[PDB]
Amino acid sequence: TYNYGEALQKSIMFYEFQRSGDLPADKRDNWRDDSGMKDGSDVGVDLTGGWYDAGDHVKFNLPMSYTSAMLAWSLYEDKDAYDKSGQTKYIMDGIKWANDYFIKCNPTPGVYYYQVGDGGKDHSWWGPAEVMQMERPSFKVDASKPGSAVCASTAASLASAAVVFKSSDPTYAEKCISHAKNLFDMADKAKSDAGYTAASGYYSSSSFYDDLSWAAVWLYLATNDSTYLDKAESYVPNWGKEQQTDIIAYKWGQCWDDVHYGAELLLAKLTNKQLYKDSIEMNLDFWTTGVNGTRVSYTPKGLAWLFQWGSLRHATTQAFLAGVYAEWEGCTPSKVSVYKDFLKSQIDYALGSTGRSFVVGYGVNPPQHPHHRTAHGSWTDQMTSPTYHRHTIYGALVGGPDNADGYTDEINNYVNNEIACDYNAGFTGALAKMYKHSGGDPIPNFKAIEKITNDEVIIKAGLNSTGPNYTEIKAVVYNQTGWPARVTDKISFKYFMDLSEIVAAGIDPLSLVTSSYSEGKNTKVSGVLPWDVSNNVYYVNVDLTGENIYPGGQSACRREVQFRIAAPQGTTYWNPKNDFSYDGLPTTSTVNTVTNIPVYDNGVKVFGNEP
Ligand SMILES: [Ca+2]
Ligand SMILES: [Ca+2]
Ligand SMILES: [Mg+2]
Ligand SMILES: [Mg+2]
Ligand SMILES: [Mg+2]
């Protein structure tokens, strides 16, 4: 079968790789670092934190809060699975990461920042989060420009977090409730998504009455104030219906844009009213046995296939709901096994039932090219380079196959290969249920400390110009950092020479003339300096300190410096052949990687050798 515990452990871990902001010292990876550190600076509010949505760096609060609410729902339903697998700390840290950010997004009563980053600008650059150079604007809703869905989705996240944190951190639970109440009030009074516009084209909302009910249900569970339960039920007639019927919609599934499925499931458990039981069973039946002659499509290999986008996201989310409902005493007895069989079949399809895993870094032949900027780690603003991902973003569930099980693992294949917060949300809960039922031990003390697979800072050089009394070098430093990607503003390199022939000529080695084209306004080439005069070794120091060299573009990641060292005009004793840094030097202005012109990062040699 499959190791569900390991799968669960990695799915939770996926979110740690999505983190924006000031990362914890207790971090268990060596390729993510501080990023989005000025988030909210444009409005004077600290909005750092939260999770990047998918393979991009925009913080879209609707999917983000849907995600944390779903993870909290799983912890609420299956704490015993989390405790037994030893993953409780990790999922709670994830839930708190998202919710600490939503709290920051509600700086004052009635104001809610729902996004940080501009989709257009963010998506136009392909590089690691740590070195983003573009503006990252903050967007907000308030009484005048409402966002009922995003406010209520966030209230649901906060309230569900309060439910699962109440026992261990009652104060934080109260903090979450305070903000949840404010955002729900905003949403409920407004009943409009008219001011929620910055996510247009990415996460535009098509409904908010579902979010209102979902939020109200969670606020009821968090506060035990039945005022919220009444509100939750009051919005039901306003939920979307199946076309030309008065029947609550049942042909889609729980997802960031439609949470009435989870709301009605919860309402059935909380009230035992037939309306809700019938509604959730209609949805679950449509997804399994079919209902009234209608049924979700199934691929030949057994994937319940809803839509071309995020098919696995949908199937595994429905698997979670089927698992939760199947365990409830109110579930029609004959359907319990049907629903539990569906949970297993859909999860197993994601884990490996077709012969390969659709979970990054897990199982057999997992996806190698998810559409994800930071895991790929390009240093040249190119989706195509490197031709492999520098990092393994463990746990990420890819979009999924087409309706015939077709799947292409390529970085530019969004339909099959995008990865996102919401894709792993329901999946995580379904995995907890499978772990509870079939086991599979998580990897003990699992960390994502990767080996550095490419020299992070290198230098290429070649002979630019030459003569009987001089040598001119063309050198290019490249920032190829990835563990973590980072700005290298304290780089320098040294070019070593043996000037024994200068001393022999009766000339002061320090009198030779050095000179320098060069990319980078701060490029400074020194005069000849002593290094090991007992062996007649001198050098030229080239300092690039101050240069904003970063792994985010062809020009951004490199600095070219051309420099020359010259003996007096008319002389012929200059001998570059006994110079340490000249040995092997490429004979033209077409540079190549050299190991004898060492590169230093803040005075520490990081590439190459010294004499
Ligand atoms: Ca909605
Ligand atoms: Ca020499
Ligand atoms: Mg820090
Ligand atoms: Mg490949
Ligand atoms: Mg020598």
Side-chain angles (χ1 to χ4, degrees), residues 1-328 330-516 518-611:
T1 183
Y2 306 98
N3 189 328
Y4 301 112
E6 180 193 337
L8 177 65
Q9 150 185 64
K10 288 176 176 177
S11 183
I12 293 162
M13 189 183 226
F14 162 64
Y15 295 103
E16 299 182 4
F17 300 124
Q18 294 299 92
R19 293 181 298 190
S20 176
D22 191 354
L23 306 190
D26 64 54
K27 190 167 63 74
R28 49 176 176 163
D29 68 78
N30 61 335
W31 53 277
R32 286 306 324 293
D33 206 336
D34 299 350
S35 71
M37 296 295 283
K38 299 180 189 309
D39 281 10
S41 62
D42 65 326
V43 295
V45 180
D46 171 10
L47 299 180
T48 63
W51 293 310
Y52 293 129
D53 185 63
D56 56 348
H57 304 119
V58 179
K59 283 148 61 169
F60 284 119
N61 291 202
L62 184 46
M64 202 193 308
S65 57
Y66 160 81
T67 297
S68 47
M70 289 296 286
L71 294 175
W73 186 11
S74 171
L75 177 56
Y76 169 73
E77 298 286 350
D78 294 293
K79 178 185 168 57
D80 63 334
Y82 287 101
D83 289 337
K84 187 182 318 302
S85 60
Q87 306 308 127
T88 305
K89 170 181 173 289
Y90 304 104
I91 188 163
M92 289 183 85
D93 281 351
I95 292 169
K96 191 163 190 299
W97 193 268
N99 285 289
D100 278 355
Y101 161 75
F102 301 136
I103 282 163
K104 291 186 188 187
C105 290
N106 181 215
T108 190
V111 173
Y112 183 60
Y113 286 94
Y114 69 92
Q115 182 172 137
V116 181
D118 176 71
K121 296 192 163 196
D122 183 79
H123 295 183
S124 68
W125 177 77
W126 191 268
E130 292 76 18
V131 298
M132 286 184 276
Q133 303 290 120
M134 77 294 274
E135 283 286 299
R136 288 174 58 69
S138 301
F139 296 94
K140 60 166 179 182
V141 283
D142 52 35
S144 69
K145 296 291 187 306
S148 289
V150 72
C151 286
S153 182
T154 304
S157 175
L158 287 163
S160 60
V163 172
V164 301
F165 268 89
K166 195 172 289 183
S167 176
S168 65
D169 194 337
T171 298
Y172 183 65
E174 287 302 305
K175 178 58 165 171
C176 286
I177 290 167
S178 297
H179 290 281
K181 285 174 49 187
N182 188 246
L183 299 176
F184 178 81
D185 191 61
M186 288 174 68
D188 192 34
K189 280 171 177 170
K191 289 188 183 71
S192 179
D193 284 321
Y196 170 70
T197 63
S200 55
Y202 308 99
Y203 289 97
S204 292
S205 169
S206 64
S207 59
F208 65 71
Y209 277 110
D210 54 316
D211 299 273
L212 284 177
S213 287
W214 173 242
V217 162
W218 283 107
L219 269 165
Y220 172 60
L221 288 169
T223 69
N224 293 298
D225 183 341
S226 58
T227 292
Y228 292 112
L229 176 66
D230 284 353
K231 280 180 170 293
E233 302 196 76
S234 79
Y235 313 120
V236 179
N238 302 286
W239 290 354
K241 295 175 183 305
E242 280 305 316
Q243 178 183 7
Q244 208 47 47
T245 81
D246 205 302
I247 301 173
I248 289 168
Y250 69 91
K251 294 184 185 177
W252 205 244
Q254 173 79 350
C255 62
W256 65 269
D257 193 30
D258 190 336
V259 288
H260 83 276
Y261 293 102
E264 72 193 3
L265 197 169
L266 248 23
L267 283 169
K269 297 207 290 173
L270 290 167
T271 71
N272 197 37
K273 293 189 183 175
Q274 196 64 231
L275 174 60
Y276 309 125
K277 301 168 72 175
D278 288 350
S279 303
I280 185 62
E281 288 192 22
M282 196 161 299
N283 174 239
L284 294 182
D285 290 344
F286 172 80
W287 276 81
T288 53
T289 59
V291 67
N292 291 299
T294 62
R295 183 173 187 251
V296 67
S297 303
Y298 266 76
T299 69
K301 292 181 192 195
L303 169 60
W305 199 89
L306 184 67
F307 184 48
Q308 64 173 308
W309 296 96
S311 54
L312 288 171
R313 165 261 312 264
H314 282 299
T316 60
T317 297
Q318 291 302 102
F320 173 54
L321 273 69
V324 175
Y325 193 74
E327 285 182 47
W328 180 53
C331 183
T332 300
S334 71
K335 299 182 191 179
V336 170
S337 56
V338 172
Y339 296 167
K340 289 181 168 177
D341 279 353
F342 169 78
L343 154 67
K344 177 172 171 60
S345 70
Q346 301 306 295
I347 283 300
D348 285 359
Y349 185 102
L351 299 190
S353 83
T354 64
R356 63 87 53 71
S357 166
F358 285 100
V359 179
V360 175
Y362 172 92
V364 180
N365 188 35
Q368 300 286 293
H369 304 286
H371 186 82
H372 195 281
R373 293 171 176 68
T374 299
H376 173 214
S378 177
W379 58 84
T380 56
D381 188 17
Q382 302 184 104
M383 199 174 316
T384 61
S385 185
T387 61
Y388 57 90
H389 275 32
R390 295 204 285 159
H391 313 296
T392 297
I393 182 159
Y394 290 103
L397 177 63
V398 299
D402 57 27
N403 69 3
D405 298 299
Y407 167 74
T408 305
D409 178 26
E410 298 191 325
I411 199 172
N412 60 312
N413 195 308
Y414 315 81
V415 162
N416 296 326
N417 244 14
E418 35 192 26
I419 53 176
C421 290
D422 79 286
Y423 282 15
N424 273 68
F427 180 46
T428 302
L431 288 171
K433 289 206 168 284
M434 285 307 292
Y435 169 73
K436 166 194 158 304
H437 168 277
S438 301
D441 303 331
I443 299 172
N445 306 305
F446 191 60
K447 293 194 174 199
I449 282 50
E450 312 179 331
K451 291 175 187 166
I452 287 168
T453 59
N454 68 266
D455 292 299
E456 295 196 287
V457 182
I458 65 172
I459 184 165
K460 297 195 173 186
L463 187 62
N464 200 211
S465 183
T466 188
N469 64 322
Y470 79 81
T471 291
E472 183 168 290
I473 304 296
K474 172 176 163 181
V476 186
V477 168
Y478 291 90
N479 175 320
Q480 310 180 145
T481 57
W483 297 266
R486 60 190 178 278
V487 174
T488 52
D489 60 343
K490 300 185 175 182
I491 299 303
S492 59
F493 65 80
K494 302 171 188 174
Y495 185 83
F496 298 93
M497 301 154 289
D498 177 318
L499 302 182
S500 61
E501 67 270 17
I502 307 302
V503 178
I507 297 300
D508 191 340
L510 307 179
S511 73
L512 299 184
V513 179
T514 71
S515 54
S516 51
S518 72
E519 309 180 316
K521 315 172 297 68
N522 289 286
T523 304
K524 173 103 303 176
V525 178
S526 75
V528 174
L529 292 168
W531 194 80
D532 171 17
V533 300
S534 73
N535 283 295
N536 296 300
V537 181
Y538 293 77
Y539 75 112
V540 169
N541 189 253
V542 176
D543 187 18
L544 294 175
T545 296
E547 287 300 305
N548 183 216
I549 317 183
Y550 62 93
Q554 304 182 217
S555 296
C557 79
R558 69 167 192 237
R559 287 298 185 281
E560 181 177 319
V561 184
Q562 286 159 179
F563 60 98
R564 160 187 298 198
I565 305 89
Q569 185 179 300
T571 63
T572 62
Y573 44 68
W574 172 256
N575 173 21
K577 305 165 200 159
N578 61 358
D579 293 355
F580 178 83
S581 295
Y582 193 77
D583 198 36
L585 184 79
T587 65
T588 62
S589 52
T590 69
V591 309
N592 179 43
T593 303
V594 297
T595 56
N596 54 0
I597 304 174
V599 184
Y600 303 74
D601 187 348
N602 194 34
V604 184
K605 180 169 69 62
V606 297
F607 188 70
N609 303 296
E610 294 170 326

Coordinates of all heavy atoms in Angstrom, one line a residue, residues 72-126:
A72 N -7.0 23.5 9.8 CA -7.5 23.5 11.1 C -8.7 22.5 11.2 O -8.9 21.8 12.2 CB -8.0 24.9 11.5
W73 N -9.5 22.5 10.2 CA -10.6 21.5 10.2 C -10.1 20.1 10.4 O -10.6 19.3 11.2 CB -11.5 21.6 9.0 CG -12.8 20.8 9.0 CD1 -13.3 20.1 10.0 CD2 -13.6 20.5 7.8 NE1 -14.5 19.4 9.6 CE2 -14.7 19.7 8.3 CE3 -13.6 21.0 6.5 CZ2 -15.7 19.3 7.4 CZ3 -14.6 20.5 5.7 CH2 -15.7 19.7 6.1
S74 N -9.0 19.8 9.6 CA -8.5 18.4 9.8 C -7.9 18.1 11.2 O -8.2 17.1 11.8 CB -7.3 18.2 8.8 OG -6.6 17.0 9.1
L75 N -7.2 19.1 11.8 CA -6.7 18.9 13.1 C -7.9 18.8 14.1 O -7.8 18.1 15.1 CB -5.8 20.1 13.5 CG -5.2 20.1 14.9 CD1 -4.5 18.8 15.2 CD2 -4.3 21.3 15.1
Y76 N -9.0 19.5 13.9 CA -10.2 19.4 14.7 C -10.8 18.0 14.6 O -11.2 17.4 15.6 CB -11.2 20.4 14.2 CG -12.6 20.2 14.8 CD1 -12.8 20.6 16.2 CD2 -13.6 19.8 14.1 CE1 -14.1 20.6 16.7 CE2 -14.9 19.8 14.6 CZ -15.2 20.1 15.9 OH -16.4 20.1 16.4
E77 N -10.8 17.4 13.4 CA -11.4 16.1 13.2 C -10.5 14.9 13.6 O -11.0 13.9 14.1 CB -11.8 15.9 11.8 CG -12.8 16.9 11.2 CD -14.2 16.6 11.8 OE1 -14.5 15.5 12.4 OE2 -15.1 17.4 11.5
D78 N -9.2 15.1 13.4 CA -8.3 14.0 13.6 C -7.0 14.3 14.5 O -5.9 13.8 14.1 CB -7.9 13.5 12.3 CG -9.1 12.9 11.5 OD1 -9.5 11.8 12.0 OD2 -9.5 13.4 10.5
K79 N -7.2 15.0 15.6 CA -6.0 15.3 16.4 C -5.2 14.0 16.7 O -4.0 14.0 16.8 CB -6.4 16.0 17.7 CG -5.2 16.3 18.6 CD -5.6 16.8 20.0 CE -4.4 16.8 20.9 NZ -3.3 17.6 20.4
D80 N -6.0 12.9 17.0 CA -5.3 11.7 17.3 C -4.3 11.2 16.3 O -3.3 10.6 16.6 CB -6.3 10.6 17.7 CG -7.3 10.2 16.6 OD1 -7.5 11.0 15.7 OD2 -7.8 9.0 16.7
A81 N -4.7 11.4 15.0 CA -3.8 11.1 13.9 C -2.5 11.9 13.9 O -1.4 11.4 13.7 CB -4.5 11.2 12.5
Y82 N -2.7 13.2 14.2 CA -1.6 14.1 14.2 C -0.7 13.8 15.4 O 0.5 13.7 15.2 CB -2.1 15.5 14.3 CG -2.6 16.0 12.9 CD1 -4.0 16.0 12.7 CD2 -1.7 16.3 11.9 CE1 -4.5 16.3 11.4 CE2 -2.2 16.6 10.6 CZ -3.6 16.6 10.4 OH -4.0 16.9 9.1
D83 N -1.3 13.5 16.6 CA -0.5 13.2 17.7 C 0.3 11.9 17.5 O 1.5 11.9 17.8 CB -1.4 13.0 19.0 CG -1.9 14.3 19.5 OD1 -1.4 15.4 19.2 OD2 -3.0 14.3 20.2
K84 N -0.3 10.9 17.1 CA 0.3 9.6 16.8 C 1.4 9.6 15.8 O 2.4 9.0 15.9 CB -0.8 8.6 16.4 CG -0.3 7.1 16.3 CD -1.4 6.2 15.8 CE -2.7 6.4 16.5 NZ -2.7 6.3 18.0
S85 N 1.2 10.4 14.7 CA 2.2 10.6 13.7 C 3.4 11.5 14.1 O 4.4 11.5 13.5 CB 1.6 11.1 12.4 OG 1.0 12.4 12.6
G86 N 3.1 12.2 15.2 CA 4.1 13.2 15.7 C 4.2 14.5 14.9 O 5.1 15.2 14.9
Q87 N 3.1 14.7 14.1 CA 3.1 15.9 13.2 C 2.3 17.1 13.8 O 2.2 18.1 13.1 CB 2.5 15.5 11.8 CG 3.3 14.3 11.2 CD 4.8 14.5 11.1 OE1 5.6 13.7 11.6 NE2 5.2 15.7 10.6
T88 N 1.7 16.9 15.0 CA 0.9 18.0 15.6 C 1.6 19.3 15.6 O 1.0 20.4 15.3 CB 0.4 17.5 16.9 OG1 -0.2 16.3 16.8 CG2 -0.5 18.6 17.5
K89 N 2.8 19.4 16.1 CA 3.6 20.6 16.2 C 3.7 21.3 14.8 O 3.5 22.5 14.7 CB 5.0 20.3 16.7 CG 5.9 21.5 16.6 CD 7.3 21.2 17.1 CE 8.3 22.4 16.8 NZ 8.5 22.6 15.4
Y90 N 4.0 20.5 13.8 CA 4.1 21.1 12.4 C 2.9 21.6 11.8 O 2.9 22.7 11.2 CB 4.8 20.0 11.6 CG 6.1 19.5 12.1 CD1 6.2 18.3 12.8 CD2 7.2 20.3 12.1 CE1 7.4 17.8 13.3 CE2 8.4 19.9 12.6 CZ 8.5 18.6 13.3 OH 9.7 18.2 13.8
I91 N 1.7 20.9 11.9 CA 0.5 21.5 11.4 C 0.1 22.7 12.2 O -0.5 23.6 11.7 CB -0.6 20.4 11.2 CG1 -1.8 21.0 10.4 CG2 -1.1 19.9 12.6 CD1 -2.7 20.0 9.8
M92 N 0.3 22.6 13.5 CA -0.2 23.8 14.3 C 0.7 25.0 13.9 O 0.2 26.1 13.9 CB -0.1 23.5 15.8 CG -1.2 22.5 16.2 SD -1.2 22.2 18.0 CE -2.2 23.6 18.6
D93 N 2.0 24.8 13.7 CA 2.9 25.9 13.4 C 2.4 26.5 12.0 O 2.4 27.7 11.8 CB 4.3 25.4 13.2 CG 5.0 25.3 14.6 OD1 4.4 25.7 15.6 OD2 6.1 24.8 14.6
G94 N 2.0 25.6 11.1 CA 1.5 26.1 9.8 C 0.2 26.9 10.0 O 0.1 28.0 9.4
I95 N -0.7 26.4 10.7 CA -2.0 27.1 11.0 C -1.7 28.5 11.6 O -2.3 29.5 11.2 CB -2.9 26.3 11.9 CG1 -3.3 25.0 11.1 CG2 -4.1 27.1 12.4 CD1 -4.0 24.0 12.0
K96 N -0.8 28.5 12.6 CA -0.5 29.8 13.2 C 0.2 30.7 12.3 O 0.0 32.0 12.3 CB 0.4 29.5 14.5 CG 0.5 30.8 15.3 CD 1.0 30.4 16.7 CE 0.9 31.6 17.7 NZ 1.8 32.7 17.2
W97 N 1.1 30.2 11.4 CA 1.8 31.1 10.4 C 0.8 31.8 9.6 O 0.9 33.1 9.4 CB 2.7 30.2 9.5 CG 3.6 31.1 8.7 CD1 3.4 31.6 7.4 CD2 4.9 31.5 9.1 NE1 4.5 32.4 7.1 CE2 5.4 32.4 8.1 CE3 5.6 31.4 10.3 CZ2 6.6 33.1 8.2 CZ3 6.9 32.0 10.4 CH2 7.4 32.9 9.4
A98 N -0.2 31.2 9.1 CA -1.2 31.8 8.2 C -2.0 32.8 9.1 O -2.3 33.9 8.7 CB -2.1 30.8 7.6
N99 N -2.5 32.3 10.2 CA -3.4 33.1 11.0 C -2.7 34.3 11.7 O -3.4 35.4 11.8 CB -4.2 32.3 12.0 CG -5.3 31.5 11.3 OD1 -6.3 32.1 10.9 ND2 -5.1 30.2 11.1
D100 N -1.4 34.2 12.0 CA -0.7 35.4 12.6 C -0.7 36.5 11.5 O -0.8 37.7 11.8 CB 0.8 35.0 12.9 CG 0.9 34.3 14.2 OD1 -0.1 34.2 15.0 OD2 2.0 33.9 14.5
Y101 N -0.6 36.1 10.2 CA -0.6 37.0 9.1 C -2.0 37.6 9.0 O -2.2 38.8 8.8 CB -0.1 36.3 7.8 CG -0.5 37.0 6.6 CD1 0.1 38.2 6.2 CD2 -1.5 36.5 5.8 CE1 -0.2 38.8 5.0 CE2 -1.9 37.1 4.6 CZ -1.2 38.3 4.2 OH -1.6 38.9 3.0
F102 N -3.1 36.8 9.0 CA -4.4 37.4 8.9 C -4.7 38.4 10.0 O -5.3 39.5 9.8 CB -5.5 36.3 8.9 CG -5.3 35.3 7.8 CD1 -5.5 34.0 8.0 CD2 -5.0 35.7 6.5 CE1 -5.3 33.0 7.0 CE2 -4.8 34.8 5.5 CZ -5.0 33.4 5.7
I103 N -4.1 38.1 11.2 CA -4.3 39.1 12.3 C -3.6 40.4 11.9 O -4.2 41.5 12.1 CB -3.7 38.4 13.5 CG1 -4.7 37.4 14.1 CG2 -3.4 39.5 14.6 CD1 -4.2 36.4 15.1
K104 N -2.4 40.3 11.4 CA -1.7 41.5 11.0 C -2.5 42.3 9.9 O -2.5 43.5 9.8 CB -0.3 41.2 10.4 CG 0.7 40.7 11.4 CD 2.1 40.6 10.7 CE 3.1 39.9 11.6 NZ 4.4 39.9 10.9
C105 N -3.2 41.5 9.0 CA -4.0 42.1 8.0 C -5.3 42.9 8.5 O -6.0 43.5 7.7 CB -4.4 41.1 6.9 SG -3.1 40.5 5.9
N106 N -5.6 42.7 9.8 CA -6.8 43.4 10.4 C -6.2 44.3 11.4 O -6.5 44.2 12.6 CB -7.6 42.3 11.0 CG -8.9 42.8 11.6 OD1 -9.4 42.3 12.6 ND2 -9.5 43.9 11.0
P107 N -5.4 45.3 11.1 CA -4.7 46.3 12.0 C -5.6 47.1 12.8 O -5.2 47.6 13.9 CB -3.8 47.1 11.0 CG -4.7 47.1 9.8 CD -5.1 45.7 9.6
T108 N -6.8 47.4 12.3 CA -7.8 48.2 13.1 C -9.2 47.7 12.7 O -9.4 47.2 11.6 CB -7.6 49.7 12.7 OG1 -8.3 50.5 13.6 CG2 -8.0 50.0 11.3
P109 N -10.1 47.8 13.7 CA -11.5 47.4 13.4 C -12.1 47.9 12.1 O -12.0 49.1 11.8 CB -12.3 47.9 14.6 CG -11.3 47.8 15.7 CD -10.0 48.3 15.1
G110 N -12.6 47.0 11.2 CA -13.2 47.4 10.0 C -12.3 47.6 8.8 O -12.7 48.0 7.7
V111 N -11.0 47.3 9.0 CA -10.0 47.3 7.9 C -9.4 46.0 7.7 O -8.9 45.4 8.6 CB -8.9 48.3 8.2 CG1 -7.8 48.3 7.1 CG2 -9.5 49.7 8.3
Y112 N -9.4 45.5 6.4 CA -8.8 44.2 6.2 C -7.9 44.2 4.9 O -8.5 44.4 3.8 CB -9.8 43.1 6.1 CG -9.2 41.7 5.9 CD1 -8.3 41.2 6.8 CD2 -9.5 41.0 4.7 CE1 -7.7 39.9 6.6 CE2 -8.9 39.8 4.5 CZ -8.0 39.2 5.4 OH -7.4 38.0 5.1
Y113 N -6.6 44.0 5.0 CA -5.8 43.9 3.9 C -5.9 42.4 3.4 O -5.7 41.5 4.1 CB -4.3 44.2 4.3 CG -4.2 45.6 4.5 CD1 -4.3 46.2 5.8 CD2 -4.0 46.5 3.4 CE1 -4.2 47.6 6.0 CE2 -3.9 47.9 3.6 CZ -4.0 48.4 4.9 OH -3.9 49.8 5.1
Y114 N -6.3 42.3 2.1 CA -6.6 41.0 1.5 C -5.6 40.5 0.5 O -5.8 39.4 0.0 CB -8.0 41.0 1.0 CG -8.2 41.8 -0.3 CD1 -8.0 41.3 -1.6 CD2 -8.5 43.1 -0.2 CE1 -8.2 42.1 -2.7 CE2 -8.7 43.9 -1.3 CZ -8.5 43.4 -2.6 OH -8.8 44.2 -3.7
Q115 N -4.6 41.3 0.3 CA -3.6 40.9 -0.7 C -2.4 41.7 -0.6 O -2.4 42.9 -0.2 CB -4.2 41.1 -2.1 CG -3.2 40.6 -3.2 CD -3.9 40.6 -4.6 OE1 -3.4 41.1 -5.6 NE2 -5.2 40.1 -4.6
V116 N -1.2 41.0 -0.9 CA 0.1 41.8 -0.9 C 0.7 41.2 -2.2 O 1.0 40.0 -2.3 CB 1.0 41.5 0.3 CG1 2.3 42.4 0.1 CG2 0.3 42.0 1.6
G117 N 1.0 42.1 -3.1 CA 1.6 41.7 -4.4 C 0.6 42.0 -5.5 O -0.6 41.9 -5.3
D118 N 1.2 42.3 -6.7 CA 0.4 42.5 -7.9 C 0.6 41.3 -8.8 O 1.8 41.0 -9.2 CB 0.8 43.8 -8.6 CG 0.0 44.0 -9.9 OD1 -1.2 44.3 -9.9 OD2 0.6 43.8 -11.0
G119 N -0.5 40.6 -9.2 CA -0.3 39.4 -10.0 C 0.5 39.7 -11.3 O 1.4 38.9 -11.6
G120 N 0.2 40.8 -12.0 CA 0.9 41.1 -13.2 C 2.4 41.2 -13.0 O 3.1 40.6 -13.7
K121 N 2.7 42.1 -12.1 CA 4.1 42.3 -11.8 C 4.8 41.1 -11.2 O 6.0 40.8 -11.6 CB 4.3 43.5 -10.8 CG 3.8 44.8 -11.2 CD 4.3 45.9 -10.2 CE 4.2 47.3 -10.8 NZ 5.0 48.3 -10.0
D122 N 4.2 40.5 -10.3 CA 4.8 39.3 -9.6 C 5.1 38.2 -10.6 O 6.2 37.5 -10.6 CB 3.9 38.7 -8.5 CG 4.5 37.6 -7.8 OD1 5.3 37.8 -6.9 OD2 4.1 36.4 -8.1
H123 N 4.1 37.9 -11.5 CA 4.2 36.8 -12.4 C 5.2 37.1 -13.6 O 5.6 36.1 -14.3 CB 2.9 36.4 -13.0 CG 2.0 35.9 -11.9 ND1 0.7 35.4 -12.1 CD2 2.2 35.6 -10.6 CE1 0.2 34.9 -11.0 NE2 1.1 35.0 -10.1
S124 N 5.5 38.3 -13.8 CA 6.4 38.7 -14.9 C 7.8 38.4 -14.7 O 8.7 38.5 -15.5 CB 6.2 40.2 -15.2 OG 6.8 41.0 -14.1
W125 N 8.2 38.0 -13.5 CA 9.6 37.7 -13.1 C 9.6 36.2 -12.6 O 8.8 35.8 -11.8 CB 10.0 38.6 -12.0 CG 11.4 38.4 -11.5 CD1 12.6 38.7 -12.2 CD2 11.8 37.8 -10.3 NE1 13.7 38.4 -11.4 CE2 13.2 37.9 -10.2 CE3 11.0 37.3 -9.2 CZ2 13.9 37.4 -9.1 CZ3 11.7 36.9 -8.1 CH2 13.1 36.9 -8.0
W126 N 10.6 35.5 -13.1 CA 10.8 34.1 -12.7 C 12.1 34.0 -11.9 O 13.2 33.8 -12.4 CB 10.9 33.2 -13.9 CG 10.8 31.8 -13.6 CD1 11.9 30.9 -13.3 CD2 9.6 31.1 -13.3 NE1 11.4 29.7 -12.9 CE2 10.0 29.8 -12.9 CE3 8.3 31.4 -13.4 CZ2 9.1 28.8 -12.6 CZ3 7.3 30.4 -13.1 CH2 7.7 29.1 -12.7

